[PDB]
Every structure is written in C-alpha cells, then in structure tokens.
Amino acid sequence: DNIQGITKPAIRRLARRGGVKRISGLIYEETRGVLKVFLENVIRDAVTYTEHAKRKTVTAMDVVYALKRQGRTLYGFGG
Amino acid sequence: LRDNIQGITKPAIRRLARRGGVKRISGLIYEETRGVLKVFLENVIRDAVTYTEHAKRKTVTAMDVVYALKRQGRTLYGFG
Amino acid sequence: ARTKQTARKSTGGKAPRKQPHRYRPGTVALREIRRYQKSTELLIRKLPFQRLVREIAQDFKTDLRFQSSAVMALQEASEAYLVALFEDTNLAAIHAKRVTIMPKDIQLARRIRGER
Amino acid sequence: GGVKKPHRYRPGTVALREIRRYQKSTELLIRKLPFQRLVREIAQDFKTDLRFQSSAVMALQEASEAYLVALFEDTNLAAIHAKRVTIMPKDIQLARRIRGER
Amino acid sequence: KAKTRSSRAGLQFPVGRVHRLLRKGNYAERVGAGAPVYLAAVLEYLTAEILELAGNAARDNKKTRIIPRHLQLAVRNDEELNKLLGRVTIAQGGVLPNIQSVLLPK
Amino acid sequence: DFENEDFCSACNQSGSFLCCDTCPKSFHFLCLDPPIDPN
Amino acid sequence: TRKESYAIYVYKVLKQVHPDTGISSKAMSIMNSFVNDVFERIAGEASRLAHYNKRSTITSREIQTAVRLLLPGELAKHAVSEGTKAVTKYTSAK
Amino acid sequence: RRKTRKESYAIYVYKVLKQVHPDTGISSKAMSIMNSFVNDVFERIAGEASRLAHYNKRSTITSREIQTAVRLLLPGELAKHAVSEGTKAVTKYTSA
Numbered sequence: 174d175n176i177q178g179i180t181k182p183a184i185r186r187l188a189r190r191g192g193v194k195r196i197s198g199l200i201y202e203e204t205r206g207v208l209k210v211f212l213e214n215v216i217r218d219a220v221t222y223t224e225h226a227k228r229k230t231v232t233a234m235d236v237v238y239a240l241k242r243q244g245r246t247l248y249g250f251g252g
Numbered sequence: 253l254r255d256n257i258q259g260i261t262k263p264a265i266r267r268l269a270r271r272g273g274v275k276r277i278s279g280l281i282y283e284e285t286r287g288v289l290k291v292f293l294e295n296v297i298r299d300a301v302t303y304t305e306h307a308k309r310k311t312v313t314a315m316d317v318v319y320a321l322k323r324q325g326r327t328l329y330g331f332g
Numbered sequence: 333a334r335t336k337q338t339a340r341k342s343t344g345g346k347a348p349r350k351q352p353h354r355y356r357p358g359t360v361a362l363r364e365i366r367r368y369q370k371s372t373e374l375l376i377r378k379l380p381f382q383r384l385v386r387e388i389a390q391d392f393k394t395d396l397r398f399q400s401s402a403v404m405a406l407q408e409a410s411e412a413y414l415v416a417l418f419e420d421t422n423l424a425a426i427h428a429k430r431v432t433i434m435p436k437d438i439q440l441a442r443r444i445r446g447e448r
Numbered sequence: 449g450g451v452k453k454p455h456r457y458r459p460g461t462v463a464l465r466e467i468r469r470y471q472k473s474t475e476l477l478i479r480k481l482p483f484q485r486l487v488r489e490i491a492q493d494f495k496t497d498l499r500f501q502s503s504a505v506m507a508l509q510e511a512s513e514a515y516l517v518a519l520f521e522d523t524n525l526a527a528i529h530a531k532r533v534t535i536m537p538k539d540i541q542l543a544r545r546i547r548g549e550r
Numbered sequence: 551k552a553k554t555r556s557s558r559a560g561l562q563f564p565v566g567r568v569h570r571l572l573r574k575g576n577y578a579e580r581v582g583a584g585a586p587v588y589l590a591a592v593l594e595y596l597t598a599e600i601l602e603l604a605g606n607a608a609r610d611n612k613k614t615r616i617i618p619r620h621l622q623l624a625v626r627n628d629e630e631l632n633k634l635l636g637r638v639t640i641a642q643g644g645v646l647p648n649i650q651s652v653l654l655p656k
Numbered sequence: 657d658f659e660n661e662d663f664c665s666a667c668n669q670s671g672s673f674l675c676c677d678t679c680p681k682s683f684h685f686l687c688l689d690p691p692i693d694p695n
Numbered sequence: 696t697r698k699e700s701y702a703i704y705v706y707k708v709l710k711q712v713h714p715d716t717g718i719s720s721k722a723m724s725i726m727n728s729f730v731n732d733v734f735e736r737i738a739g740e741a742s743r744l745a746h747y748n749k750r751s752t753i754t755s756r757e758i759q760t761a762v763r764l765l766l767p768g769e770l771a772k773h774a775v776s777e778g779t780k781a782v783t784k785y786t787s788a789k
Numbered sequence: 790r791r792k793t794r795k796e797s798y799a800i801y802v803y804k805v806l807k808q809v810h811p812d813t814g815i816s817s818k819a820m821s822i823m824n825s826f827v828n829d830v831f832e833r834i835a836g837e838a839s840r841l842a843h844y845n846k847r848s849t850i851t852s853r854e855i856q857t858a859v860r861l862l863l864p865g866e867l868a869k870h871a872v873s874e875g876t877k878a879v880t881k882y883t884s885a
C-alpha cells in the first residue's frame with residue numbers, strides 16, 4: 174500500500190516530464206510494479222554494501238555505490 | 253579495398269535476420285543493416301587498432317578484438 | 333446448490349456489541365509538458381517516496397535507517413529512471429501511429445532496453 | 449482441359465521452414481572472405497597495412513553476427529509492436545534508439 | 551610430503567593458482583589465505599552448474615562430447631546463468647530456437 | 657463460469673446467499689419466493 | 696611458451712559431475728574464458744568493496760559480499776553455501 | 790576531534806571556473822556534481838590504463854598507455870582535444 178502512495182498524478186507528472194501526452198489508465202499500475210522491482214534492485218545492493226560495513230544505517234554514498242554497480246551512475250550525491 | 257560492404261550480400265543479411273526470427277524483410281532494410289554493421293565493426297576495429305598500436309604490434313590480433321568487444325560491453329567467449 | 337457467505341458475520345448488529353473558457357484536451361497537457369520540462373524539482377512527493385523505501389527495504393534488512401541524502405538519492409535515481417523509460421515509451425508509441433502510452437508500449441521498451 | 453500447376457509453397461511456409469533450419473544452425477552466415485575484406489577496408493582507415501590474424505577476423509565476425517541477430521530480434525518485436533510482420537528501417541531505428549547507441 | 555591446498559579445501563579448481571592471480575591482479579594490497587579458497591569454491595560451482603546443464607543439453611542431441619552449442623542452450627535456457635552471462639556472446643552458440651505467436655499460421 | 661454477486665439481487669444487501677447456477681445473480685435465503693430453508 | 700589455463704581442473708570437475716562425457720576444445724576455451732571473466736568480476740567487485748570500506752585486504756568476506764552482489768538470484772545462495780563449506784573445510788584441515 | 794580531511798577537487802574546479810568565466814560562480818550542488826564527475830572520469834581512465842598495461846604483460850602506467858586509454862574512452866573530438874593538451878602539458882613538465 175505504500176506503493177499505492179506513488180499516486181496517479183505523480184505518475185502523470187513523470188510522464189509529462191517524459192513528454193507523454195496521453196497516458197493510458199492501465200499504465201499507472203504498471204509503472205508501480207516496474208518502479209518497485211527497480212528500487213528493489215538498488216536498495217538490495219544498497220544494503221549488501223551496508224551490511225558489509227557492518228553499518229546498520231544506510232548512506233547516500235552506498236546508494237550511489239549500488240547505482241554504480243547496476244550501471245547508472247548518479248552524480249551529485251558524493252563519490 | 254573499397255566498398256566491400258556489398259559483400260554482406262542480401263542473401264546473407266537475410267539469413268541473419270532469418271536467424272533472428274523475422275519472416276518478412278522489407279527492402280530498405282538491407283541497406284540500413286549494412287550501415288549498422290559498419291558502425292559496429294567500426295568501433296570494435298577502431299578500439300582494436302588502438303590496442304594494436306599500443307602493443308606496437310602490427311598484426312591486429314584476435315586477442316585485441318576480444319578486449320575491444322569487452323570495452324563496448326559485448327564480451328565474446330571462445331578466443332581468450 | 334452453490335452457496336456463498338458475504339456478511340462474514342456470525343451475528344448481526346455487530347456495532348451494538350460490547351466488543352466558461354475551457355481548453356481543448358491536450359493544450360494544457362503540452363503547456364505542462366513545457367512546465368515539467370523546464371523545471372528541475374522532484375515530482376514524486378518525498379514522504380510518500382521515503383515510505384516506499386522503508387516498506388520495501390524492510391525485506392532485505394530490518395531496522396535499516398536511511399541517511400536523508402539517501403532517500404533523496406533514491407528519489408533522484410527513480411525519477412531519472414522513469415523519465416528515461418517514459419521518453420522511450422513515448423517513442424514506442426509514436427512508432428505505432430499513436431499518441432497514447434499504453435502498458436504494452438512499456439513491456440516492449442524494457443525488452444529492447446534489455447532490462448528484462 | 450486440366451492444365452498443370454507447379455507445387456509452390458505459399459508465401460511464408462518456405463520462410464518458417466528456413467527459420468527452423470537456421471535457428472538450429474550455429475554455422476556463421478555472412479561468408480568469411482566477403483567479411484574479411486569488409487574489415488581490411490574498415491581498418492585501412494584506422495591504421496595502414498594492419499595485418500590481421502585468421503582468428504581476429506573469425507572473432508570480429510562471430511561478434512558481428514551475434515550483434516546483428518540480437519538487433520534483428522528486437523527489430524522483430526518492434527515490427528510486431530505496430531501489428532505488422534514486415535520489418536522496416538524505422539524498427540532497426542526504434543530498437544537502436546532505445547539501446548542508446550543513437 | 552607436501553599436500554595441495556585444494557585437497558585441504560576439498561576442491562578441484564586450483565586454490566593456489568587463484569591466489570597468485572589474486573595477488574598479481576593487484577585487486578588489493580594484501581590478500582588473505584581464505585579468499586582464494588572461497589573463490590575457487592565459487593568458480594567450481596559456477597563451472598559445475600553450467601557443465602551439468604550442458605550435460606543435460608547434450609545427451610538430448612545424442613552427442614558424446616560437449617560442443618560449444620550445448621553451452622548456449624544451457625545458458626539461455628536457464629534464467630540465472632543468463633543474467634550472469636547476459637551480455638556475453640558465446641562462440642558458435644546460435645540462438646535459442648523461438649518464433650513469435652503472431653508469425654504462426656492461423 | 658462467472659462469480660455470483662456478493663450482494664443480494666433482491667434487497668441489495670450483504671449476507672449468506674443462494675447462488676444461481678446459470679445466472680450471475682445471488683439471492684438471500686429469505687428473499688426468494690417461496691423462501692428456502694438454509695438446511 | 697607455457698600457457699596457464701583451467702584445462703585439467705574443469706575436466707576433473709566434469710568427470711566429478713559426469714564421468715562419461717567428452718568436451719570440445721573450443722568449448723573448453725569457452726569454459727576457460729568464462730571462469731576467467733567471472734573471476735575478474737568477483738575479484739574486482741571485492742577490490743572495490745574493500746577500497747570503499749577503507750580496508751586493505753581481500754578477506755573471504757569480501758568475496759562473499761561480492762558473490763552476492765554479482766551472481767544473480769539463487770546462483771548466489773548456492774555459491775555462498777559452497778564457498779562457506781569450502782572455507783570451513785580449509786580451516787578444519789588447516 | 791576536528792573532522793578528517795575529505796578529498797575534493799573543489800578548490801581546483803574553481804580556478805578553472807575562474808578562467809573560463811572570471812565572473813561566474815558555482816553552487817555547492819553543481820560543484821559536488823563536478824567533483825563526482827572528475828572522480829568518475831578519473832577512475833574510468835585510470836582503470837583503463839591499468840588493463841592496458843596488464844594486457845601487454847608489462848607493469849607500469851606511463852604516458853603512452855594513458856594517451857591510449859583516454860583515446861579509448863573519451864570519444865571523438867574530446868579525445869584529440871585532450872591528447873594534444875596532455876602531451877603539451879607533459880612536455881612542459883619535462884621541460885623543467
């Protein structure tokens with residue numbers, strides 16, 4: 174249900190930034206699952222890294238570190 | 253030599269596409285593809301002549317080719 | 333004779349117990365294409381996003397606090413991923429003589445992207 | 449009276465038959481010598497008189513046929529995307545406009 | 551009498567070699583004793599699952615020896631080995647046989 | 657098949673229903689004519 | 696002249712799995728390049744992990760955090776399990 | 790317990806923002822972007838140098854093998870417009 178927190182108008186805003194002019198209605202709920210599985214990949218690696226530092230808290234450094242692994246580097250948050 | 257791209261004959265570009273599971277190859281694809289083969293083979297071969305010169309070798313080696321493919325991401329197993 | 337139960341209540345009365353100008357469709361849409369393209373702020377309300385991360389990280393490790401910059405890193409990364417995926421979808425649609433992204437248009441994009 | 453008519457498989461039967469034929473072959477498709485030359489003129493532009501092994505060519509091919517059979521494959525899905533069985537130059541293009549080489 | 555480190559670890563891949571390599575690879579300044587043992591342990595596993603799956607593939611095509619093709623099937627049929635060896639293009643593999651449903655005759 | 661409703665077709669209220677076999681409507685045991693005993 | 700490769704080792708583990716099956720030489724080279732590549736990826740990630748955690752040594756731990764960060768899904772669990780029992784037998788046999 | 794020194798090229802990025810634009814300025818967020826940029830591209834080019842060396846069975850990162858990798862990574866004009874500045878810079882160093 175925290176997933177349903179990613180609301181429609183928010184997915185519409187992402188589509189607008191993405192240049193989409195008419196969003197199907199069945200897209201909204203497809204974008205959730207795709208979103209989840211992706212976050213569920215970064216955050217997984219974010220935590221492997223976390224439990225390697227024996228740290229219990231995660232860091233933004235570990236987040237961009239997990240992105241570097243996945244492939245999609247993120248500049249602006251360290252490293 | 254020159255313009256040997258035509259060597260990748262249509263009969264073959266097809267056979268590849270046939271390999272890829274297509275059934276109807278529109279014309280105007282045989283030209284597009286050869287263009288794609290010549291951007292790929294470019295980069296790979298370029299990154300291979302750079303590797304070739306670095307080793308001050310002349311004989312472009314298959315070893316270099318593999319390392320080149322890796323850089324671009326398309327790793328190839330079977331040669332080293 | 334097939335029967336089913338829907339009240340789901342062995343007894344009734346459970347509560348009484350001790351226990352005007354209007355634009356054409358699309359003009360406003362293109363206007364706020366321009367608005368959300370010239371802009372750089374973050375489009376998925378934060379709190380909701382942070383929560384998405386708490387309930388989903390919970391699985392990999394309990395009691396995992398997240399540096400604030402981190403959930404901001406997850407947001408940025410997620411919005412970048414989805415805006416890239418949505419540019420591709422619009423293309424996967426404008427391909428099929430159409431102007432409406434549809435689920436299928438994104439199950440495909442991701443296949444060509446190879447993210448599947 | 450009864451005039452003959454040759455036995456011709458309908459458009460598509462010969463197609464799918466050689467599809468099943470070629471998806472079981474591992475042999476390279478583009479012919480070797482024709483390909484080898486493709487390079488000597490695609491390399492002469494990067495360094496002169498670069499000799500090439502008879503294995504670099506075979507590798508630079510296996511890597512090419514592999515790249516092309518992948519792209520054709522996403523081209524097809526892209527052709528089916530518009531509910532059509534003919535692939536088009538736009539398809540090889542949409543496909544490549546999404547892998548990020550374009 | 552000198553025994554090998556693999557028989558100490560119970561493995562077939564070489565643990566010694568994978569130490570040298572780890573050292574000369576300069577992956578890091580110092581390498582411990584158990585790191586090449588674990589790596590040889592994981593490499594033999596991955597070499598085994600892939601060899602098993604190749605063995606399941608071959609007998610099917612009734613061929614005694616494994617040939618490069620049997621190794622593509624094994625890799626593309628499996629959904630794990632395919633994420634691993636997913637940007638890898640094996641030699642003489644062909645492709646997994648597959649044709650789309652809309653391309654089938656009615 | 658089809659799942660019968662979850663609201664009685666006679667009184668539009670929830671409860672234990674007798675489900676029509678060749679029809680997607682559901683009726684209360686007391687809502688029919690004549691009313692059907694639940695045993 | 697001496698060429699180091701994993702020929703006899705992969706052959707052994709093949710007979711351990713199938714003591715009746717042959718192998719092609721080209722297919723062998725597929726196996727040798729494949730184990731070399733996965734070795735490079737597991738060792739590199741490890742090197743990185745270490746350099747992030749300001750450590751300096753490649754402990755069996757890193758190779759794990761790594762195998763679980765690279766090998767995907769289940770392939771990992773079974774890798775870890777076998778690596779942990781392998782290092783357990785290494786320390787038991789000293 | 791003063792915080793330990795965090796490595797950054799920020800001070801440097803500014804000298805270079807002050808030549809290309811003697812009167813512009815940066816914001817923390819863009820500077821940190823630039824630091825992540827230089828660290829990332831440096832790691833890319835330095836990792837390539839490494840392999841180039843290992844491949845050739847030699848063990849020393851020199852100027853040749855980096856002119857080579859910067860070429861293999863930085864694409865197109867960027868490469869040439871770098872290698873030239875790089876050789877100048879090396880010769881001016883070795884000059885004195």
Ligand SMILES: [Zn+2]
Pocket residue numbers: 676677678679680681
């Ligand atoms: Zn009825």
Ligand SMILES: [Zn+2]
Pocket residue numbers: 664665666667668669683684687
């Ligand atoms: Zn009723």
